[PDB]
C-alpha cells in the first residue's frame, strides 16, 4: 500500500521557523498582526519613476524595510539583489530557529525565484557594449544565475544535502517547499531551508506584465485595487516581499527542543498543458494537485477547514481557481486571498503565502480578504471578508499556480 | 529497509528513446558513430563578433545544424531560443518514440536550463529604452521565464502530470533527469519526458565566462583545446548542444512494446558549501552524491563498470572530480570526458551526456577521450583514450557539477 503521512509510510515533517520581508513589515509577526488589522502594504508608487515611463500601473507595495539598507559596500558589489535578499533572510531565519547545529550533510536548502539576478544581465550588457569584454565582472554569471540565490543561503548556513531551485514563474516559492518536504520524506535530508524570493518593483517587469493585461490599474485607490474573488477585481497588484521558512522531520526537532508551528504534510505538482499565460478554465488539473497533496498526507477533501488561495484578482485567474477548489472537494473550506492585502511577489508569493498558512493553523484566525464586497457568481466560495475568521483549523491547502501551467498545492496540518 | 530499485521498492524506469543536437550532428545516432571515430565538434569561431569584439576565446563548436533553420516566422516571434530548441527537440523525441497516445495526466515534462530566454530580456530592454514600455511585447515574460522551454514541450506535447524546471547551471540537465526519476517513482506520473536546453555561442556568454578565466584560450588548434584530465588543460570549451530522454516505467514501456535503451536506476543530489564559482577540492560531497545514486539504485562501487565524467578540462574541477570518483570507490572504472569531443553546453551538459552514458550501455562501447596526451600525474583514472573502447559495461555512473556547488551523479544499467 501507497506510503502517506497519516500511515507513516512517510516520515513526519514539522515547520520550526518562518521569516518574511513584506510590504507591511520586516518581522512576520507584526506582518501577520496588521493582517489581522485588516491593514493593506498597497500605496501610490512615487512617481518621477512612473512619469519618466508614464506606466499605465501607479501603484505597489515596496518593502517596509529596504533589503539594501542591510547591505554594506562589498555585497552590493557582489551579490545580485536577490542574492542580497537570500543572505538577509536565511540569517534571521536561522537565528529565529536558535542558531542550530545541524549535520551539514543531511541539511538542504530549497528556494525558488521567477528570474534571478537580472539586473546583472541588463548591467553586464551595458557594460560590454560600452567598453568590451573587459568591462564584464568575473561575478557576473554567478550573480546572474537563478540558482545564485539558493546557493548563496547554502553556503552562508552550511547546507551539503544539496541546494535546488525550482522555476514555475508565480509557484516557484510553493514548490520550493514542495521539492525540499520532497527531500526530506525521501530520506535525503533531515532538514531544509525553504521558499522564495524575488526582485523589487521596477519599470520593465510592470510594462512586461502590464502589456499583458494582468495587471490592476485603479490607481486612485491603491489600497482598494487588488481585490480576488471579487466581481469588480481587474487584474493582479505588486507587492515585494521574500519569505522562508525551516521544515525538519519531528525526530529532528524533538531531538533539539524546537517547537513546531505547523505539519508540512504533502505536496501536489500537476500541469495544464492548456496555455502559456492562461490557467485552464475547468480547473481540472489544478484540483488535481490539491488532491495529490491530500493522498500524500492521508486526507480527504472534507478534512480541508482552509484554503489559502492563490488569488491573484485576474478575471479568469480567479474564476479557474475556484473551479479548480470545487474538483478537489474543496470548495467548503474558508477560503483567504493574502494578495488582496501584500500583493503578489511572483516567485516568492507562494513562500510567503505557505508561511500565512502555518500562521492560520498555528493562530486558529483567518484574516480578512481584502476589498471583497460584490460576491461574483461564478465564484461559488466562502471568502472570509469584513473581520477575521476564528475557528479551529486542523488541516489546510496552500494553492500556488505559474504561468507555463504549473500547479502546486501544500498540505498543512495544526502541529 | 528504505526502498531501492533493486529490492522492487522503486519501479522500474527505463529510457526508451533519445534525442539530441549537437556540433558534430543534429542525429544522435550520428553524433554517436562521430564520437566512436574520434571526431571533435569544436572549430574557429567565425561570427564576425570575434574581432568585433576582441575576444580572448576565438573557438567553440556551433550547433551543425542551426536550430532555426527549422523554424518559421511564429516561432521566431513568439518563442525565446530556448523554447525553439525544445519545441524543435520535444517533437523529434515524440516521434523517435513512435508518437505514444500516453495518458496526459500520467505524463510528466523535467527540463533543465542554465538561464532562460535572457536574450529577450536585452531584446525588452532595449525596445522600453527607445520607445517606452509599450514596446515591450505581450509575449515577452512568458519567452523570458526560466521554465519557458519546459512549459513549450509540455504544452506541445500534452503533459499534465507537472512541468518541472530545476536550475543548477552546469549541472541543470543531469538534475532535470534526477527529479523525473523522482516524480515517476513517487507515483505522480508513469512517464516523463526530461534533460536540458541551452542558449548559442554568444558574445556577452564568451565574456562574462572568460573573465572568470575558466575557459580555454588555445585559439590556434581549436580541436585540441578541451583536454579534460591532460596535464595540459587551460579550461572549458563551449560546445552547443541540447537533449531530451523518454523515461517511462518498465511496465509502461512493455505496455505498448517500446524497447528500453537502458534502465535509469537511481540519482543522487548534494552540496559542498565550499564556493560558488569552484568545487571542493576534496571530491567528497561530490562522491557522496555517486554514492546516493548507487544506494538508491541498490548497487555497490564494485557495480559500476563506466563513469561519465562532468570533465570540463579546467585544472581544479577535473583534480576535484578525481577525488570525487575515489571517494565513491569507482576509480577502477572506465572513465570518458565527453567535452573533450562535444565542449560544454551548459545547462544542456549533463542531459547530453545522460544520453551517452545511456548508449555507452546499450552498444557497450565508450569513445575516445580526445586530448588525452599527458596524463595529469596527480590524476590516477583509467580515462579511456586514443580507440572506443568495447566493454562489457553492465551499470554507469553519468557525473555533472555546477556553479553554486551542485553535485548530481544518475545510476544507469544496461536493459
Ligand atoms: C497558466 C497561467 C496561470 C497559472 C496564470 C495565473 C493565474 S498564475 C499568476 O500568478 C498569474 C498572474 C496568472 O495569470
Ligand atoms: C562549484 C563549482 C563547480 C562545480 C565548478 C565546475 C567544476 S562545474 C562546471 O561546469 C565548471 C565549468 C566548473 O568550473
Ligand atoms: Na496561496
Ligand atoms: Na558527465
Not at 22 to 49: M, N, Q, R, V
Not at 193 to 210: K, T
Not at 313 to 332: F, H, L
Request: hydrophobic share 40%; proline share 6%; glycine share 12%.
Amino acid at each position: 500500500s501507497q506510503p502517506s503521512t497519516a500511515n507513516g509510510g512517510f516520515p513526519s515533517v514539522v515547520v520550526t521557523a518562518v521569516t518574511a520581508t513584506t510590504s507591511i513589515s520586516p518581522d512576520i509577526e507584526s506582518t501577520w498582526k496588521g493582517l489581522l488589522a485588516g491593514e493593506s502594504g498597497i500605496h501610490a508608487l512615487e512617481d518621477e519613476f512612473v512619469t519618466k515611463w508614464d506606466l499605465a500601473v501607479k501603484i505597489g507595495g515596496h518593502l517596509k524595510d529596504p533589503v539594501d539598507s542591510h547591505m554594506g559596500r562589498l555585497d552590493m558589489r557582489r551579490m545580485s539583489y536577490v542574492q542580497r535578499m537570500g543572505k538577509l533572510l536565511g540569517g534571521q531565519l536561522w537565528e529565529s530557529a536558535g542558531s542550530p547545529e545541524v549535520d551539514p550533510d543531511r541539511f538542504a536548502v530549497v528556494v525558488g525565484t521567477g528570474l534571478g539576478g537580472a539586473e546583472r544581465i541588463v548591467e553586464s550588457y551595458d557594460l560590454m557594449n560600452a567598453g568590451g569584454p573587459r568591462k564584464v565582472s568575473p561575478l557576473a554569471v554567478q550573480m546572474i544565475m537563478p540558482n545564485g540565490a539558493a546557493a548563496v543561503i547554502g553556503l552562508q548556513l552550511g547546507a551539503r544535502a544539496g541546494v535546488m531551485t525550482p522555476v514555475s514563474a508565480q509557484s516557484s516559492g510553493s514548490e520550493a517547499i514542495a521539492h525540499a518536504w520532497r527531500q526530506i520524506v525521501m530520506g535525503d535530508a533531515d532538514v531544509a531551508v525553504c521558499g522564495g524570493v524575488e526582485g523589487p518593483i521596477e519599470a520593465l517587469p510592470i510594462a512586461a506584465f502590464s502589456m499583458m493585461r494582468a495587471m490592476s490599474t485603479r490607481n486612485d485607490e491603491p489600497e482598494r485595487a487588488s481585490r480576488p474573488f471579487d466581481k469588480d477585481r481587474d487584474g493582479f497588484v505588486f507587492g515585494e516581499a521574500g519569505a522562508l521558512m525551516l521544515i525538519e522531520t519531528e525526530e529532528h526537532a524533538k531531538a533539539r527542543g524546537a517547537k513546531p508551528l505547523a505539519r508540512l504534510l504533502g505536496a501536489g505538482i500537476t500541469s495544464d498543458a492548456f496555455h502559456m499565460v492562461a490557467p485552464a478554465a475547468d480547473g481540472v488539473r489544478a484540483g488535481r494537485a490539491m488532491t495529490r497533496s491530500l493522498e500524500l498526507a492521508g486526507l480527504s477533501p472534507a478534512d480541508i477547514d482552509h484554503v489559502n488561495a492563490h488569488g491573484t484578482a485576474t478575471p479568469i485567474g480567479d474564476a479557474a481557481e475556484a473551479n479548480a477548489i470545487r474538483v478537489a472537494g474543496c470548495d467548503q473550506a474558508a477560503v483567504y486571498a493574502p494578495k488582496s492585502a501584500l500583493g503578489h511577489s511572483i516567485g516568492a508569493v507562494g513562500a510567503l503565502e505557505s508561511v500565512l498558512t502555518v500562521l492560520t493553523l498555528r493562530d486558529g484566525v483567518i484574516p480578512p480578504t481584502l476589498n471583497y464586497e460584490t460576491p461574483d457568481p461564478e465564484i461559488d466560495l466562502d471568502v472570509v471578508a469584513g473581520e477575521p475568521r476564528y475557528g479551529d483549523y486542523r488541516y489546510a491547502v496552500n494553492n500556488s499556480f505559474g504561468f507555463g501551467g504549473h500547479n502546486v498545492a501544500l498540505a498543512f496540518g495544526r502541529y
